[PDB]
């Protein structure tokens, strides 16, 4: 009786949200960006090849200096690369080799990683001893760790496969806030530029926007037909893009509270593993299961170019903070750095 | 045209490769096994004979280091993280023979044996295990023999038309699982009969992994 009545009210609320989104859907992003000229053909060459990973690479993250980056592979090795010289600055042996994510602290003093071991390990990069040591192990998630991102040296947000996201106090080792509401495994998260909000994508084909300080879900974005594997904030923080197993990439807007554009092609039938934006946001780079990395025009939903230099699934990619270069990681155990030429 | 400190950084990087190579080769000669199987399927009994989220167990048998990974605590969707094990030497699959006349605790209408058969073909025919040999364990062999006399196998398999004895009913179930192999060319299924007091459970995995190692060597050497 009471349960039946309540679940009917939920359907009415869902219809109210759908009607509200339809009310503000006066125009289409495709119509708005029809007049602007296309980016043309985007040709990028492999300037550097980072060798040394001996297994599938699952994650990489640039440092804030736009020169150092950290990558994680399932050979049980965390490697920090000097992209200018291809020198390896550090090699961090991971206690658990089944790593799925890695993060570079904005200060550059810490890195984080975690996978099927349900643990977020914090590594100190600036020690008087000259070696990287574990400073914290963040326990509390009941599923695998899918993504993690530092806000500063003391706060980090992690998404897990136990359907929850958490905000951690690194000094005390306790999760100050727990973000609940996803009905599937959360696969990725992206921090807003001001680090006051973050979005997460789960396997329930939905993306939720979370308030870091308040600790509740502000908005939920649906529209995908399969599990969401990747998510990335737009450089201004007012939008984010996702990549799913349905061979589509979608750009969601926070303020419009609905999907704006889908990035898919009929030839593409493989899942998407990673997404990132260029500094201006004009290019959306997505890694695919078909061994390629496609650079998309975010505004016009056109495939601007292809990075084809890997013999297995492109599992991760990232764009520098200054926009100078893009790194792509793949299951073929190689990292490649791309940029154009005059 | 490198400065005196840039050249020293390069020498540091080559010292890291000297240690990546040392660790990468040590990991290449070790055996990675994915331990799969359902609730009360004997999965934990096998671990009891070979002594967070994922439970990794190491053991040494005849100068060979095995890494057996138990993912029973991962309640998430299997298809998401299963690709992380693409490249394991073999998969150890535990099936309870006695769970043929029983039904699932939750469903209360789906047979336990049919659940494993659906689980087996979801793993055997998985795209990441295309050329990954599977070690199929048929546990509780002794308890199955007692239960055949009372409960006939026709409850689980209507198409069965055979003798009510262990030596014929068990072989029918054994070939039913091996029949689920949708690609009998790129992979093999190794089937073994364990028990609660057996001492040949680790030997079978050692033998089955050895045949997988030979197969992998032939591909690398170009003979295959």
């Amino acid at each position, epitope marked *: 009786s009471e349960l039946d009545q309540l679940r009917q009210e939920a359907e009415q609320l869902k219809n109210q949200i759908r009607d509200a989104r339809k009310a503000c859907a006066d125009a289409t992003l495709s119509q708005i960006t029809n007049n602007i000229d296309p980016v043309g053909r985007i040709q990028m060459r492999t300037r550097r090849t980072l060798r040394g990973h001996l297994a599938k690479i699952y994650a990489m993250h640039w440092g804030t*200096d736009s*020169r*150092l980056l950290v990558s994680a592979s399932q050979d049980g090795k965390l490697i920090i690369w*000097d992209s*200018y*010289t291809t*020198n390896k*600055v*550090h090699a961090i042996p991971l206690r658990s080799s089944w790593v799925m994510t890695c993060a570079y602290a904005p200060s*550059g003093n810490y890195v984080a990683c975690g996978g099927l071991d349900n643990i977020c390990s914090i590594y100190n990069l600036k020690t*008087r*001893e*000259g*070696n990287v040591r574990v400073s914290r192990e963040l326990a509390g998630h009941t599923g695998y760790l899918s993504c993690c991102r530092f806000l500063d040296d003391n706060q980090i947000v992690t998404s897990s496969g136990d359907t929850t996201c958490a905000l951690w106090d690194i000094e005390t080792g306790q999760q100050t806030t727990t973000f609940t509401g996803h009905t599937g495994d959360v696969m990725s998260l992206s921090l807003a530029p001001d680090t006051r909000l973050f979005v997460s994508g789960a396997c329930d084909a939905s993306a939720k926007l979370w308030d870091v300080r308040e600790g509740m879900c502000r908005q939920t974005f649906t529209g995908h037909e399969s599990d969401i594997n990747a998510i990335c904030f737009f450089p201004n923080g007012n939008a984010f893009a996702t990549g799913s197993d349905d061979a589509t990439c979608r750009l969601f807007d926070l303020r419009a509270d609905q999907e704006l554009m889908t990035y898919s092609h009929d030839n593409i039938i493989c899942g998407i593993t990673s997404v990132s934006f260029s500094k201006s946001g004009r290019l959306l780079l997505a890694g695919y299961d078909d061994f390629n990395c496609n650079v998309w025009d975010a505004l016009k939903a056109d495939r601007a170019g292809v990075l084809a230099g890997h013999d297995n699934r492109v599992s991760c990619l990232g764009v520098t903070d200054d926009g100078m270069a893009v790194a792509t990681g793949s299951w073929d155990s190689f990292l490649k750095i791309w940029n154009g030429s005059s | *045209t*490198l*400065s*005196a*400190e*840039d*050249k*020293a*950084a390069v*020498e*540091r990087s*080559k*010292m890291i490769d*000297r240690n990546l190579r040392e660790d990468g080769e040590k990991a290449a000669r070790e055996v990675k096994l994915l331990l799969l199987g359902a609730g009360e399927s004997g999965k934990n009994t096998i671990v009891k004979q070979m002594k967070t989220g994922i439970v990794e167990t190491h053991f040494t048998f005849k100068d060979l280091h095995f890494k057996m990974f138990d993912v029973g605590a991962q309640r998430s969707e299997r298809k998401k993280w299963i690709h992380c094990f693409e490249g394991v030497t073999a998969i150890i699959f535990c099936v309870a023979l006695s769970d043929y006349d029983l039904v699932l605790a939750e469903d209360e209408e789906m047979n336990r044996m049919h659940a494993s058969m659906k689980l087996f073909d979801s793993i055997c025919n998985n795209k990441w295990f295309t050329d990954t040999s599977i070690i199929l364990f048929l546990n509780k062999k002794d308890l199955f023999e007692e239960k055949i006399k009372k409960s006939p196998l026709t409850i689980c398999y209507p198409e069965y038309a055979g003798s009510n004895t262990y030596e014929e009913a068990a072989a029918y179930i054994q070939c039913q699982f091996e029949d689920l192999n949708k690609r009998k060319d790129t992979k093999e299924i190794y089937t073994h009969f364990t028990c609660s007091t057996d001492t040949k459970n680790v030997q079978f995995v050692f033998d089955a992994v050895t045949d997988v190692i030979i197969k992998n060597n032939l591909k690398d050497c170009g003979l295959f």
Partner: single-chain antibody, 231 residues
Framework: DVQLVESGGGLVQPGGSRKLSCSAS????????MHWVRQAPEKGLEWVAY????????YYADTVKGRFTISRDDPKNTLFLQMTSLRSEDTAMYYC??????????????WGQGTTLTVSDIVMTQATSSVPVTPGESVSISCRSS???????????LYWFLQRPGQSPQLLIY???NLASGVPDRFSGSGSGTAFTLTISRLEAEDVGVYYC?????????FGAGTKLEL
């Protein structure tokens, strides 16, 4: 804590041999390159030898090349300097200096206490030998180099050290602008080409001492004469 204890020094006959040891504790010794720097009595610092991380690269000063041998024992975390045919010119305090090399590292950040030995090329110029100073007043120290220290990679390999009376040298500024760990923010390094300035705002009693500028653009590493601050 990070420690570097030197031993083996003492009074030796001319033409003799002596073995200097540098024991390292509290840090990853095998990950750090090591330098020997000596200081003659009432004189400035003088670089002796260098061994790289992994022992692949070894450098010697011209005045000691062929007579001195530098070696390390990674399992024992000990650094060695084998000296032979010791002359009266070798009477000095020998300092053990650690230096690690990667992007953004701070070489020469920690120095040892030094050991005393008694026996019975880019030119770095610090013309101003002494500067009378008072606490709380701003002081600028100038350094000159015969060659331009700016490399094509954008780095300017100039280092500043402070040796307080009775104490080991301490790193202040590395690569001509960066501030070393544990050094107060009042120190600031500014320079261009061959002329460099070290600005010390709100000078304090601890800042009193001799300041040395060293170049790391190329080997051999050469030191300036040194600028002394006195009250």
């Amino acid at each position: 804590d990070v420690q570097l204890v030197e031993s083996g020094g003492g009074l030796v006959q001319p033409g003799g041999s002596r073995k200097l040891s540098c024991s390292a504790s509290g840090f990853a010794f095998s990950s750090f390159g090591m330098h020997w720097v000596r200081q003659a009595p009432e004189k400035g610092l003088e670089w002796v030898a260098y061994i790289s991380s992994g022992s692949g690269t070894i450098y010697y000063a011209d005045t000691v090349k062929g007579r001195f041998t530098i070696s390390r024992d990674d399992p024992k975390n000990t650094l060695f300097l084998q000296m032979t045919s010791l002359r009266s010119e070798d009477t000095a305090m020998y300092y053990c200096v650690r230096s690690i090399y990667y992007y953004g590292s701070s070489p020469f950040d920690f120095w040892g206490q030094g050991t005393t030995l008694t026996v019975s090329d880019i030119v770095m110029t610090q013309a101003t030998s002494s500067v009378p100073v008072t606490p709380g007043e701003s002081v600028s120290i100038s350094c000159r180099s015969s060659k331009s220290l700016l490399h094509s990679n954008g780095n300017t390999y100039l280092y500043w050290f402070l040796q307080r009376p009775g104490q080991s040298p301490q790193l202040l500024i590395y690569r001509m602008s960066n501030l070393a760990s544990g050094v107060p923010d009042r120190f600031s390094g500014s320079g261009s080409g061959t002329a460099f300035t070290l600005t010390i705002s709100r000078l304090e009693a601890e800042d009193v001492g001799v300041y040395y500028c060293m170049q790391h653009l190329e080997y051999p590493l050469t030191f300036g004469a040194g600028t002394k601050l006195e009250l």
